[PDB]
Amino acid sequence: TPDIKLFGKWSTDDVQINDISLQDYIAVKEKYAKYLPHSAGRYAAKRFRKAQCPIVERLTNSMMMHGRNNGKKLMTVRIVKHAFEIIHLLTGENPLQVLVNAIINSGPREDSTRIGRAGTVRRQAVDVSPLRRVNQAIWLLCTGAREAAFRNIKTIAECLADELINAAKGSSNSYAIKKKDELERVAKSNR
Amino acid sequence: VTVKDVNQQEFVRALAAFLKKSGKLKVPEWVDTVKLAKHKELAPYDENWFYTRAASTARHLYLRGGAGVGSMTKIYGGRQRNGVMPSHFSRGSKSVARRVLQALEGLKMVEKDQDWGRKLTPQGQRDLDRIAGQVAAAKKK
Amino acid sequence: QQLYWSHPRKFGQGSRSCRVCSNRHGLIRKYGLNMCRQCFRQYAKDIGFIKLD
Amino acid sequence: AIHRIRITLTSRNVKSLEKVCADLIRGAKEKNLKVKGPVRMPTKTLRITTRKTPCGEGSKTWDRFQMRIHKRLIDLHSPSEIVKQITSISIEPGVEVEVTIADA
Amino acid sequence: PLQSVQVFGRKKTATAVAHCKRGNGLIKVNGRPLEMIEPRTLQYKLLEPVLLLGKERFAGVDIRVRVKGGGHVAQIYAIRQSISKALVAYYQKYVDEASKKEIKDILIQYDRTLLVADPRRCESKKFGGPGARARYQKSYR
Amino acid sequence: RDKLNNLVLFDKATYDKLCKEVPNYKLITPAVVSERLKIRGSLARAALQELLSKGLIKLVSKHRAQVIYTRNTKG
Amino acid sequence: PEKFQHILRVLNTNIDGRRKIAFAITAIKGVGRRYAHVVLRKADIDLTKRAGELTEDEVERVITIMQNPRQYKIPDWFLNRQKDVKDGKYSQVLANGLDNKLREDLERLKKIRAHRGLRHFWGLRVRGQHTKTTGRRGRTVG
RNA sequence: AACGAGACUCUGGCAUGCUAACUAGUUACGCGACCCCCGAGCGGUCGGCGUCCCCCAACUUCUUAGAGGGACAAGUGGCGUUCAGCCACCCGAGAUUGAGCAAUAACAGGUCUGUGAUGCCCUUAGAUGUCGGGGCUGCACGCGCGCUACACUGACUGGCUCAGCGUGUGCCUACCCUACGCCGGCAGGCGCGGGUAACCCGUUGAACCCCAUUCGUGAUGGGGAUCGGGGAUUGCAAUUAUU
């Protein structure tokens, strides 16, 4: 508090969680603030140990895929500093509040699975863990920007920051909020 | 200051400028026909490359105890793409670096010192630290 | 014999052999060894090496 | 005269080596020649990694062999006579010894 | 007496021996200021203990560090781990227990292996595949 | 791939729009100028450098692979 | 600004004013990117602007500095051809003359009827390469 | 009761304890010398930056290698027949870091082209045992292991900055690793010097990474296949292009 750490420009207070079903699986402000999203980390060796490391750190981790960006985590932090910068200018909100909203609006609430009966495909609708919601929601919105910048004049920074605006709002003009409702649309059917 | 106390990306780009201002250096004939290292695919983007490389040369002599033409090349060498074949390391040109060191030595900021190898002249060490404080005075480190 | 009975071999495969059977190709040159890999194994225990890892 | 004489030991067996080093440090200390203890040098690895099959067939397997030599050296400064006296005594196992004329 | 206590840091082969000697200010690493050390994107990280603890634990020391080993990243964690640990040891030994006990509690709150060394190191390649656990493709028929 | 073409020299309308986009835009990058106009990305790079010399826009961040510009900090 | 001109024709190939000067010139055969960044600097002009921004006075000088490279002190080793063979000099060959020169050397190696011309005429690889699993195309299988 | 299992051996993670170091370092000054006011101050003096200078200085944290110690489900709380154990937690480095070695019995598995290991059969002077030059690379197809790419999370050009396992002439019948100086755009040539190696090459100043220019979504500068012309090095010889 009298030694409160920012991101080097952003407050980690004034960050809400608008679920009681996803608070304490978002890590952003209990003492999870850090100036960077790089650490040695422990993300393994016990099942309940992933939820104890920041959301901002998780974000940096999950956007380094496709076989040529692995082992280039340092380049990834470059993309995150521009992302938040653009988000703050663009709408005016503290860009962490943007990200938390974006996660909460994108998480699917029911999903389907397989079951083998009579040698024919039957499907069953099931619910999801809070830990599952977070894992899915971080994956989905990152997939949008990764796809978009794959032959465009637009850079990966621009694409990613745009995608967090439309996710944080209920706009439904994003790769995340599209696919979220697609899954639920299946789950209704084979319920 | 010591050159360590200031930024070094900034140091060289001002040390190069110092030389080019003062009419310093003797420059080879070849300067628009030069690949500037074996592994490079194209000629320099800059015509002032002789001045630029002399900056980086003189900086290293301050730091390490100084060594011959071989070691200078080893500092400069990088990765060589081989097309379909996978990459390898290589060490660049020699005759460019041998002219760089000899041009500096012409101003007597370098000299073949003890144990057969170049070392930076005490007059040379003076001039580095002279503009080293100008960098910190100018902007502010 | 006369002026033909031989052709210079002083580099490459035909100018080295091995000391336990004079076999070529599969052999270990390293450390001054000159032993063919099939036979090297059988004299491995005999002062030389021992397995440890 | 008193010459700085360096006795290098080298072997393949760490037990057999070390006790013979202790003996040579003893014989020196007995006559108070102001010897320096062992300076144990980095152990070096000879490796041979080759096929286990004669005439390839079956899964590809290899086998790491290693021999570890050991070097260590004791520095003496004393007359060269009494050195060659104490050197030649109390050595039984296969362990090599190398006597040096002088050192700086 | 002559106040000097030495520590080291580790992270996957990268030693950084940091002596803490009485003084005031003037912390360095490799005879350079730690206000720039050159990836400088992870610049906030090595500064992190100094910034978080304030300048009032660094109100009577010069700490200087020599390094070797590791890559660009692992060096940053080594130097950070060493200067942090240096500070703790210095207060335990020439000041008092309750001096360092506070400071120990502060660091271990936001622990990031600031008082311990990462055990993890690389595992050996065994044949029949690249890497230490991956295997070449296996074709049936 | 698609077929598209961009303008590699300036015209009247490009310059005039360039002066009037400034108070209306919070973000200005060369990429966004590529889309709103029909203009090449390196042309658009230098076009924004001109505006900064006038003081119409303000730099806020810089990189090798990106440059960001803002309005006049008037909201 | 600078609306003056765009796409133009020079010797034997049409060169756009759309692209940067050096890279624009490369389309002409016998001139690579490496060959052009030299010749522009001997001509002492910018390479930091478009090819449509050059004037007629300037481009007239370009072709002269190109086609007499030894006389403007570009080294001999930096040319396409050193002692062509049976012509006796260092030479630099450009677009439509390149093809004519090339077709001669093919004809020559079937004139003497070396191994080379036979491989050329049969449509098989000249250099040491396997053709067992290479080339394909193909079809007609058993 | 026995074998295999574990035990064992090697390897990795823990010691400011022990043993001792010009073929390993550090610290401390003495410094004298260079350097800049670079910091307090003034430029003196005091301090900072490294090198030569360092010692019959002090030390062994860092490097090295030997003996030892440390880890046990030990402690606590649950759970279990309250047994064998299991789960969580404290302490702290969690009892599980990775390999080596590996049974009985079997296969008509592979290898007579490793063997001066070997049975039998065959051939043996017009020889299946030697020289010359040619082939094992020959291409309508098919299949397998890989390598490089399809770009902007990029390429290109400058600038900044970090390692580890090894290896090396004195060997077979003849050969090594290379610093340094000079000449050449480059490949390379040439003159001198060290190293039997914790001593010399080499404080192995490696790459991705990092920072700033240029290119602009275009089969484009992405890609470098194919192919023309020319220069070097190895060898007795390079043609089907050794590199």
From Swiss-Prot, chain A:
UniProt cross-references to PROSITE patterns, sorted A to Z: RIBOSOMAL_S7
Matching CDD domains: uS7_Eukaryote
Cross-link Glycyl lysine isopeptide (Lys-Gly) (interchain with G-Cter in SUMO2) maps to 34
Q: Which UniProt keywords apply?
A: Acetylation, Cytoplasm, Isopeptide bond, Nucleus, Phosphoprotein, Ribonucleoprotein, Ribosomal protein, Ubl conjugation
- Kindly list the positions at which Phosphothreonine occurs in this protein: 1
Task: Give Gene Ontology CC terms.
Answer: cytosolic ribosome; nucleolus; small ribosomal subunit
Whether Nucleus counts among this entry's keywords is yes
Q: Name one GO biological process term.
A: translation
Where in the sequence is Phosphoserine found? 129
Q: Where in the cell is it found?
A: Cytoplasm; Nucleus, Nucleolus
Question: What is a GO molecular function of this protein?
Answer: RNA binding
InterPro entries for this protein:
Ribosomal_uS7, Ribosomal_uS7_CS, Ribosomal_uS7_dom, Ribosomal_uS7_dom_sf, Ribosomal_uS7_euk/arc
Give the chief site where it resides.
cytoplasm
Which residues are annotated with the PTM N6-acetyllysine?
A: 34
Check the record and name the Gene3D superfamilies matching this protein. Ribosomal protein S7 domain
Which Pfam families does its entry note?
Answer: Ribosomal_S7 (PF00177)
- Subunit architecture: Component of the small ribosomal subunit. Part of the small subunit (SSU) processome, composed of more than 70 proteins and the RNA chaperone small nucleolar RNA (snoRNA) U3.
UniProt record similarity statement: Belongs to the universal ribosomal protein uS7 family.
The record's section on NCBIfam families has: PRK04027.1, uS7_euk_arch
Say what the protein does.
Component of the small ribosomal subunit. The ribosome is a large ribonucleoprotein complex responsible for the synthesis of proteins in the cell. Part of the small subunit (SSU) processome, first precursor of the small eukaryotic ribosomal subunit. During the assembly of the SSU processome in the nucleolus, many ribosome biogenesis factors, an RNA chaperone and ribosomal proteins associate with the nascent pre-rRNA and work in concert to generate RNA folding, modifications, rearrangements and cleavage as well as targeted degradation of pre-ribosomal RNA by the RNA exosome.
Swiss-Prot record, chain E:
Answer whether the UniProt record assigns the keyword Nucleus to this protein.
yes
In the UniProt record, what gene is named as encoding this protein?
Answer: RPS16
The organism's taxonomy opens as:
Eukaryota, Metazoa, Chordata, Craniata, Vertebrata
Q: Where in the cell is it found?
A: Cytoplasm; Nucleus, Nucleolus
**GO MF terms, alphabetically ordered:** RNA binding; structural constituent of ribosome
Keyword annotations for this protein?
Acetylation, Cytoplasm, Nucleus, Phosphoprotein, Ribonucleoprotein, Ribosomal protein
Q: What is the recorded name of this protein? A: Small ribosomal subunit protein uS9
Family recorded in the similarity comment: Belongs to the universal ribosomal protein uS9 family.
| CC annotations in GO | cytosolic ribosome; cytosolic small ribosomal subunit; nucleolus
Q: Which organism is it from?
A: Oryctolagus cuniculus (Rabbit)
User: Which biological processes are named by the entry's GO terms?
Assistant: maturation of SSU-rRNA from tricistronic rRNA transcript (SSU-rRNA, 5.8S rRNA, LSU-rRNA); translation
According to the UniProt entry, which residues carry N6-acetyllysine?
Answer: 55
* Reported function: Component of the small ribosomal subunit. The ribosome is a large ribonucleoprotein complex responsible for the synthesis of proteins in the cell. Part of the small subunit (SSU) processome, first precursor of the small eukaryotic ribosomal subunit. During the assembly of the SSU processome in the nucleolus, many ribosome biogenesis factors, an RNA chaperone and ribosomal proteins associate with the nascent pre-rRNA and work in concert to generate RNA folding, modifications, rearrangements and cleavage as well as targeted degradation of pre-ribosomal RNA by the RNA exosome.
UniProtKB/Swiss-Prot annotation, chain F:
Q: Keywords on this record?
A: Acetylation, Cytoplasm, Ribonucleoprotein, Ribosomal protein
Q: Does the keyword Acetylation apply?
A: yes
Q: Name one GO molecular function term.
A: structural constituent of ribosome
The cellular location(s) given in this protein's UniProt record come to: Cytoplasm
Q: Does the keyword NAD apply?
A: no
* N6-acetyllysine found at: 3, 12, 20, 26, 54
Where in the chain are disulfide-linked cysteines found? Answer: none
A single GO BP annotation from the record? ribosomal small subunit biogenesis
Q: Name one GO cellular component term.
A: cytosolic ribosome
Instruction: List residues modified as N6-succinyllysine.
Output: 12, 54
Coiled-coil spans are: none
Oligomeric and partner information = Component of the small ribosomal subunit.
Q: Which family does it belong to?
A: Belongs to the eukaryotic ribosomal protein eS25 family.
This chain's function reads: Component of the small ribosomal subunit. The ribosome is a large ribonucleoprotein complex responsible for the synthesis of proteins in the cell.
**Protein name, as recorded:** Small ribosomal subunit protein eS25
- Gene label: RPS25
First and last residue shown, out of the full length, are: 40 to 114 of 124
UniProtKB/Swiss-Prot annotation, chain G:
Q: What is this protein called?
A: Small ribosomal subunit protein uS13
Biological process according to GO: translation
- What UniProt keywords are attached to this protein's entry? Acetylation, Cytoplasm, Isopeptide bond, Ribonucleoprotein, Ribosomal protein, RNA-binding, rRNA-binding, Ubl conjugation
Q: Which GO terms describe its molecular function?
A: rRNA binding; structural constituent of ribosome
| PANTHER family documented for this protein | 30S RIBOSOMAL PROTEIN S13/40S RIBOSOMAL PROTEIN S18, SMALL RIBOSOMAL SUBUNIT PROTEIN US13
A Gene Ontology cellular-component term = cytosolic ribosome
* PROSITE patterns to which the protein is assigned, alphabetical: RIBOSOMAL_S13_1, RIBOSOMAL_S13_2
Q: Indicate the quaternary assembly.
A: Component of the small ribosomal subunit.
Instruction: Spell out the InterPro entries in the cross-references.
Output: Rbsml_uS13_C (IPR027437), Ribosomal_uS13 (IPR001892), Ribosomal_uS13-like_H2TH (IPR010979), Ribosomal_uS13_CS (IPR018269)
**The species this protein was found in:** Oryctolagus cuniculus
Q: What does this protein do?
A: Component of the small ribosomal subunit. The ribosome is a large ribonucleoprotein complex responsible for the synthesis of proteins in the cell.
What subcellular locations does the record give? Cytoplasm
Q: What SUPFAM superfamilies does the annotation carry?
A: S13-like H2TH domain
